[PDB]
Design a protein around this ligand. Structure first.
Ligand SMILES: *[C@@H]1O[C@H](CO)[C@@H](O[C@@H]2O[C@H](CO)[C@@H](O)[C@H](O)[C@H]2NC(C)=O)[C@H](O)[C@H]1NC(C)=O
Ligand SMILES: *[C@@H]1O[C@H](CO)[C@@H](O[C@@H]2O[C@H](CO)[C@@H](O)[C@H](O)[C@H]2NC(C)=O)[C@H](O)[C@H]1NC(C)=O
Ligand SMILES: *[C@@H]1O[C@H](CO)[C@@H](O[C@@H]2O[C@H](CO)[C@@H](O)[C@H](O)[C@H]2NC(C)=O)[C@H](O)[C@H]1NC(C)=O
Ligand SMILES: *[C@@H]1O[C@H](CO)[C@@H](O[C@@H]2O[C@H](CO)[C@@H](O)[C@H](O)[C@H]2NC(C)=O)[C@H](O)[C@H]1NC(C)=O
Ligand code: NAG
Ligand code: NAG
Ligand code: NAG
Ligand code: NAG
Ligand code: CL
Ligand code: CL
Ligand code: CL
Ligand code: CL
Lengths: 938, 938
């Protein structure tokens, strides 16, 4: 009996900072979520929701509203099993899993939702006070005339504000005493639901005998009358009753002069509660939507027809109803599911208790609502259900007459259950606004975090006593209920959206480790919160989705100013960092290669660009899309030449826009040229957005003399590039390359494919041909095969491969001896299966294994060294078959062989590359990195 | 007379590729925009829009719709004066200024809008054929009964499809002949508008005398009758007329038996067109909304009251109307403003002709519409206006009876003006879909670019003949017109939004050089297109805004796969590049500093991190927000140690997540340690997102012996950092710094502010105190002043400065002689006004010039060298006043002096820093870069 610390209230602040310096599933998450869902609609308005619209349509109102908040409880459960479940309640659990910017626009839509909920229970409690307890202490009891609902809304205003100012005084003084009495308010709800189920089984054996007077197809107000037969015999003195005096002039006048409907259509008396035995459910299955001011009447009765006059004794339809109006009245029942996580600081295992405690509390209350819809339409008369305030049963609760001990067990029971749910919302709403006043995410809400000596917000209570006071001057509980259901549907939408939006775009710290969670359930439960929001008002849903969007972008602007200094510039800095951090986790090793480029520009003396045509050819290859980095090296000391490094970056960036290159500049000052180039190749980019291919020019003038520095810098750059596993594009005779405004009228582009790098040698003429300059050229492809292979099948297969990819080229094979391509065919099968050992890695069927050009070509099958039965790697037989067909061809692409395994062959390697490209105008040498698989040619 | 190449048609493709290998304002932009705006609503339906709803509300329908498309013509004009105005029409002018992804969802909403416009003119042309020309060649002329509109919709289906299949055959064969006759269709519209203004001035002197028969407060169908007096005297043989035979049984029966309304309520005859003279405008100022099936009747007539029976001779209200229905019917009038730019390939100055030609064509047609609303309600009888098909005026056009020569000048004139506007939309819609089939932005629309030998799309015409054919089977012109106004409002919304969205976020290539353009005009004209879209249907506006949004994200996904290889990974690569390119243009030199950080980690042998506590202190300073780069250097050769560089990056990144650091790793292999460190300081980042502050550890053990390398690497790093104008944070005794889980219970943080770097020395304890570890400490600030300054005013002013910023520290001043702070006070006024020469730069009042701590402190006012009347820079008097107050203080922040101007003083500089920080546990030495102004302390 020592578990008296039940405390269904909210955690909030002052219990979050103490955790930065137990309970179970039943007493911690299940029971606080059960107490905050049951409210006033189950007692005051559920009989009116079944009576209007019948059983078959009130079953669809509850089932739509309960499945809307069930699918939100799965997204709310996936939040609790993602992080490390911080201890502050529901605001701190969302603002760390969904980050900021969904703390606001969820915490602010939750603060307005519970502030108008506190004005709804107070308006609900005065209605149980002015009716059903003391219908004698009204203030504005005007005379009986055509207006009395306007005289009822004035009594709710003067008693409502006097009831709000007394509950605010309780929370400001005795908040430790509203916390100890949380188990007393829970006992008033459980014994009231059991009192309804007791009497609905009793009524199958003994109905409670509540009578109602009917004039015949018209229902009369049972108050102000005594007998139900219009005769009122005392003893053989037949003075007519009070019922005669309302329809006629006065008594003692059995002659004549009464109304037309009264002289026919006899006065009878039927049963108000026939019980579960007699099948009255066949009359309550159908709808009864009527306009305001009509008469509540039943079928299976008797009525002449002679029209009559309206009297102040019938029962009247109070408001005009529809299907869309009853959804907004019933929806504050199912709200309250965020009360499963408001005791997150005391659970022993708060990640397996919160999902199973919230979901099982939804099935409990949705079973009480769905079973009471059937058990009201099958026990109570249709004319007793189709009116509020119970004027046909002498002024009782319609749900109260069904109960077994008394009607007073629900009247006095749902009065403390209503005042208890109002004190909870009036103390959990200032504890939420005090939390958003912390963390400094909204700067003009800074004054509302002004805690006393122990928690207990001061100025946050004065707004909640002033916005709920605006919900009191609006009387009429049927009007305040569609207002607060717009706010709770607004915060259920953003939780369901942000959970599905983060598991699709692969947000970095989001792994919802939880069974029975998918991205489709948070999306199916997002379309239902949008459907119920539009059919309510549609002009208070559009304007409540933009101020929940204008408060979204205000947090991101203010959150970037405190992070990156200023405002608008910080928005682009935070969007670039978040996109870069997402790039680190995806299985790299992509299977659609694309060149990125790193253009190495040589600067001479006077700090000018030596080959400005390299930026022009880099622009024609990329055509303005993708990443392009331009790198340069100034030889000198940085402590003296730092002013010359800033001026040299301006002339490169000015040349960069004259050649239409979209990219970045990267200049460095090094002591040696070979060291500064080697550092630019391995340290450019910011992770993920790094380069892929190095592009440099040919060293024109290496055969000069006395200067091993000019050509050993080139071989050193090739060796660094092939060690970092990058591609290499070397352009020879770059000064004869075309400008951006010259446009070759006709010509060829010849590709000499030699055993290796097949995919890269077909993508590069394809990307170049979709430019203004190289548009009218045509692609010719020459493949070098050997005598042992099948040249007939290789020609028939490469032509079949280009047909399925829409390339529009022509293929011709040429066979050469093994003593002529020995620089290429030597290191094959050391590295060829090394490409096979890497080919698999990921998944790839045969519809994509027949799109790689190297794989479709590979259906085939005395020493030779680089240094001086030992012969040198010659190229005089390979060049004369290239220049025999590829002269006057405007561009020649051919793959270059690798450098030797050791030095003492570097000058023989430069002489191999000089006699290979002898007699061609524009040559582009290609070297593959090793890992380049291309399956889609744009 | 040689200007016969008028050609109001669309440019499209085949005239865009020819410009990659004149006309004026009147004949090029003004007149083609004037011909495509005037249509069928001005002739067939404008009299019905004035008759219903009166003059005062039909004036508000035109003024709302014309100002909606005027504000779009300003955003469309700002597009044409931004780029270099490409030559392809309106699709190529938008898809280059707004980029891609607004080419689609604007070009696709424009293609559907003109396809349903071609079904509207064809349905409009059959109505001028079946009525008003030959009401004898119908097919489904059913018997006169309660349904005849259903017998009218079947005649529009079988003649509509036979008229669509003949105009498709014209465009496929004779598109050069529909282009030459563009001036002939323009002449049929201009002489028809002048024929209306001629007769409306003639009617002030001589009305055209069109009579209409009235039974008295009831309007009769004037066809099928001959006389209007129900007597029909031939010669003294009073046989009753045809009017008697419709209401009674038959003729020759002057006795009795006719209806109740016919025996009273005499037959009269009023004027159909009284003219501009008699003030009939006082009866047409007000609304006449009526349900379907009511009788058109006028006030100021005579009617008994005796109800009657409905006859097949009255005129009936055909459809039920509202205010929102008439907006969707009138709105296809003002559409067509994109026809100003469809001749952009032939204008001589296409940037000053398109804005002044489009805007002046809007004022012309909006003057014809606004003046004809007043000139119809003041000339024509209200019962002739309030019906279509003209059955009260013997079957004429209601606009035709007002004209001066004949009613036939409008009937035969608006038949060729309607067929001419239908052939234009049936040839400009396949030319648009053929353009979006090019550029490969949508891959499953690839088959519809299948041009013949000269342009002329084949398969694109077969969709336009199949979607407009779906608009023919839907008959009833009043229903097709709200469908196409939903598409034209959908593409006017995206042009107005993207013009205002790009001039707010500062998109790089967007400078709309044009007078009278603001971002507020494109936003005011965006709320009007949203207002007219929601009041039309609201369930065909929400579903037409998501499929225009699902086609938005499909282009960005497909546009990133062809750019970055694969799909989802490419979306983050393109978002990071676009955010980085926006960062290059904004005036740098921000005025709210924030440390970015570059942590230099020393690796020893075995390739481990020597000081792993530097990553922990870097995490406590940044707290997970901002950019943090970790840099390391491996000493060796990259061609051998490239496998060890990949493994060393894994252990750094694994240590990086154990200390909760969000950032990037950057490791390099250099030959020397000093060269690789110097390159990391000047070449990290990618432009804009670069570092701001270098953080390194103190060289513990430099006083060892034989190893000038350990401490000259430190002074070299300080000299490189102060030459690149960066800040420096040196941490001494980093192994005694706290971990992330230890949390000092109480203590101080002492800041020793010495003459310089005032703003940085107050931000760093503020950012450190908002962490878990340094939360409970308190900040003490010691400022060093001189004897000549005012210590009393400096104490009173620094305490006033911290009050207005919410810092919660305490300030105490200490005065020292000039022979003790000589290492600090020496190079002041060489660099102090250099800070003043940079202070201004941007704008800054006094409310922010009193928030910089160095500026509020500056209200104040024998040789000493670094090498050996010449004394050394000593620190034995400065240290004993720091250690007298800042021992047991848990952190000491003090600014360090600069290195000497030359070497031969480097070892005296390391000995100055050793005796300065003698006897303190944790010291952090701060050095300002020179350009650090802080005005907002978070
Ligand atoms: C209730 O009203 C009905 C008629 O509205 C009365 O029914 C009549 O009863 C008498 C007596 O048996 C019959 O002769 C008549 O034929 C009934 N009328 C009809 C239309 O069937 C009945 O009397 C009224 N009830 C009372 C108690 O007076
Ligand atoms: C209550 O009585 C009224 C009138 O006596 C009923 O309305 C009549 O319904 C019948 C169809 O059964 C119509 O033919 C009459 O024209 C209606 N009369 C009037 C005046 O409306 C009404 O149906 C009765 N209520 C119920 C629930 O049956
Ligand atoms: C038109 O109808 C009106 C009544 O609806 C007829 O007006 C009557 O005319 C006679 C002849 O002067 C008067 O004595 C009556 O007083 C008029 N009636 C009223 C109510 O004022 C009129 O005769 C009809 N027109 C014709 C041509 O017969
Ligand atoms: C056409 O005639 C009808 C009936 O004669 C007019 O309707 C009457 O309007 C008066 C108000 O002036 C009412 O008091 C009557 O009750 C109405 N009678 C009916 C049967 O509706 C109607 O106003 C006339 N039309 C116009 C334009 O005045
Ligand atoms: C009337 O009632 C009284 C008492 O109920 C009785 O004494 C008297 O006899 C009755 N009269 C008749 C005529 O029944
Ligand atoms: C009531 O009785 C009086 C007196 O005969 C009579 O004048 C009056 O009209 C009656 N009331 C009604 C409503 O008929
Ligand atoms: C009737 O009309 C005819 C010709 O209009 C005329 O000759 C005859 O006299 C008329 N009769 C009377 C009675 O007016
Ligand atoms: C027309 O006349 C015939 C013959 O007298 C009569 O039976 C019939 O009812 C009349 N028509 C009407 C509509 O009264
Ligand atoms: Cl409730
Ligand atoms: Cl909730
Ligand atoms: Cl039109
Ligand atoms: Cl348009």
């Amino acid at each position: 009996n020592r578990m008296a610390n039940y405390t269904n209230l909210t955690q909030g602040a002052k219990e979050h900072e103490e955790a930065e310096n137990q309970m179970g599933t039943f007493m911690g998450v299940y029971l606080p979520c059960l107490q905050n869902i049951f409210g006033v609609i189950l007692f005051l308005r559920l009989t009116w929701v079944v009576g209007t619209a019948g059983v078959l349509q009130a079953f669809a109102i509850v089932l739509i509203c309960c499945c809307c908040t069930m699918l939100t409880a799965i997204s709310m459960s996936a939040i609790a099993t993602n992080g490390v479940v911080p201890a502050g309640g529901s605001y701190f659990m969302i603002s760390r899993a969904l980050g900021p910017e969904f703390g606001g626009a969820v915490g602010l839509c939750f603060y307005l939702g519970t502030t108008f909920a506190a004005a709804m229970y107070i308006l609900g409690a005065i209605e149980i006070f002015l009716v059903y307890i003391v219908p004698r202490a009204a203030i504005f009891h005007s005379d009986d005339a055509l207006k009395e609902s306007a005289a009822m809304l004035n009594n709710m205003r003067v008693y409502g504000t006097a009831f709000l100012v007394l509950m605010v005084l309780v929370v400001f003084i005795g908040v430790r005493y509203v916390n100890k009495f949380a188990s007393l308010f829970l006992a008033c709800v459980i014994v009231s639901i059991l009192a309804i189920y007791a009497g609905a089984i009793k009524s199958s054996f003994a109905p409670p005998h509540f009578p109602v007077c009917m004039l015949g197809n018209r229902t009369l107000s049972s108050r102000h009358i005594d007998v139900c037969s219009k005769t009122k015999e005392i003893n053989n003195m037949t003075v007519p009753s009070k019922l005669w005096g309302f329809f006629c002039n006065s008594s003692q006048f059995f002659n004549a002069t009464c109304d037309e409907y009264f002289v026919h259509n006899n006065v009878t008396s039927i049963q108000g509660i026939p019980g579960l035995a007699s099948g009255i459910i066949t009359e309550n299955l159908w709808s009864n939507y009527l306009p305001k001011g009509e008469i509540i009447e039943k079928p299976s009765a008797k009525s002449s027809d002679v029209l009559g006059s309206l009297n102040h004794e019938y029962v009247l339809v109070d408001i005009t109803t529809s299907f869309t109006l009853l959804v907004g009245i019933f929806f504050p029942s199912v709200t309250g599911i965020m009360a499963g996580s408001n005791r997150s600081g005391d659970l022993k295992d708060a990640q397996k208790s919160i999902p199973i405690g919230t979901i099982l509390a939804i099935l409990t209350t949705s079973f009480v609502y769905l079973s009471n819809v059937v058990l009201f339409g099958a026990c109570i008369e249709g004319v007793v259900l189709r009116d509020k305030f119970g004027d046909a049963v002498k002024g009782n609760l319609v749900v109260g007459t069904l109960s077994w001990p008394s009607p007073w067990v629900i009247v006095i029971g749902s009065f403390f259950s209503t005042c208890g749910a109002g004190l909870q919302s009036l103390t959990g709403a200032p504890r939420l606004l005090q939390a958003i006043a912390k963390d400094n995410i909204i700067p003009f809400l800074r004054v509302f975090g002004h805690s006393k000596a122990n928690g207990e917000p001061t100025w946050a209570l004065l707004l909640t006593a002033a916005i709920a006071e605006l919900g009191i001057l609006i009387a009429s509980l049927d009007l305040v209920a569609p207002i607060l259901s717009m706010f709770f549907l607004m915060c259920y939408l953003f939780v369901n959206l942000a959970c599905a939006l983060q598991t699709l775009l692969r947000t970095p710290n989001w792994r919802p480790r939880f069974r029975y969670y998918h991205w489709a359930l948070s999306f199916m439960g997002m379309s239902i919160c949008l459907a119920l929001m539009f059919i309510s008002s549609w002009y208070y849903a559009i304007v409540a989705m933009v101020i929940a969007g204008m408060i979204y972008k205000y947090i991101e602007y203010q959150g970037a100013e405190k992070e990156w200094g200023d405002g608008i510039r910080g928005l682009s800095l935070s969007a670039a960092r978040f996109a870069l951090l997402r790039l680190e986790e995806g299985p790299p090793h992509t299977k659609n290669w694309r060149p990125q480029l790193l253009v190495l520009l040589k600067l001479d003396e006077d700090l000018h660009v030596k080959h400005p045509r390299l930026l022009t050819f880099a622009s024609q290859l990329k055509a303005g899309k993708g990443l392009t980095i331009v790198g340069s090296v100034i030889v000198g000391n940085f402590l003296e030449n730092y002013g010359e490094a800033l001026a040299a970056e301006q002339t490169i960036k000015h040349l960069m826009e004259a050649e239409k290159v979209k990219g970045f500049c990267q200049l460095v000052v090094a002591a040696k040229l070979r060291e500064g180039i080697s550092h630019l190749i391995q340290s450019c980019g910011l992770g993920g957005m790094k380069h892929n291919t190095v592009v440099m020019g040919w060293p024109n003038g290496w055969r000069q003399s006395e200067d091993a520095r000019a050509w050993k810098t080139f071989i050193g750059t090739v060796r660094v590039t092939t060690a970092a596993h990058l591609a290499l594009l070397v352009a020879k005779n770059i000064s004869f390359f075309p400008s951006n405004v010259e446009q070759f009228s006709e010509g060829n582009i010849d590709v000499w494919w030699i055993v290796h790098d097949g995919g890269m040698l077909m993508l590069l003429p394809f990307l170049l041909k979709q430019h203004k300059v190289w548009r009218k050229c045509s692609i010719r492809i020459f493949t070098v095969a050997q005598l042992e292979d099948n040249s007939i099948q290789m020609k028939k297969d490469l032509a079949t491969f280009l047909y399925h990819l829409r390339i529009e080229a022509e293929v011709e094979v040429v066979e050469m001896h093994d003593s002529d391509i020995s620089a290429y065919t030597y290191e094959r099968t050391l590295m060829m299966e090394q490409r096979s050992q890497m080919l698999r890695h990921m998944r790839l069927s045969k519809t994509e294994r027949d799109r790689e050009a190297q794989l479709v070509k590979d259906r085939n099958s005395v020493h030779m060294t680089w240094t001086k039965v030992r012969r040198m790697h010659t190229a005089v037989k390979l060049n004369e078959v290239i220049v025999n067909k590829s002269h006057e061809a405007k561009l020649v692409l051919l793959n270059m062989p690798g450098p030797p395994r050791n030095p003492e062959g570097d000058e023989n390697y430069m002489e191999f590359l000089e006699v290979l490209t002898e007699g061609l105008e524009r040559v582009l040498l290609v070297r593959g990195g090793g890992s380049e698989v291309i399956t889609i040619y744009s």
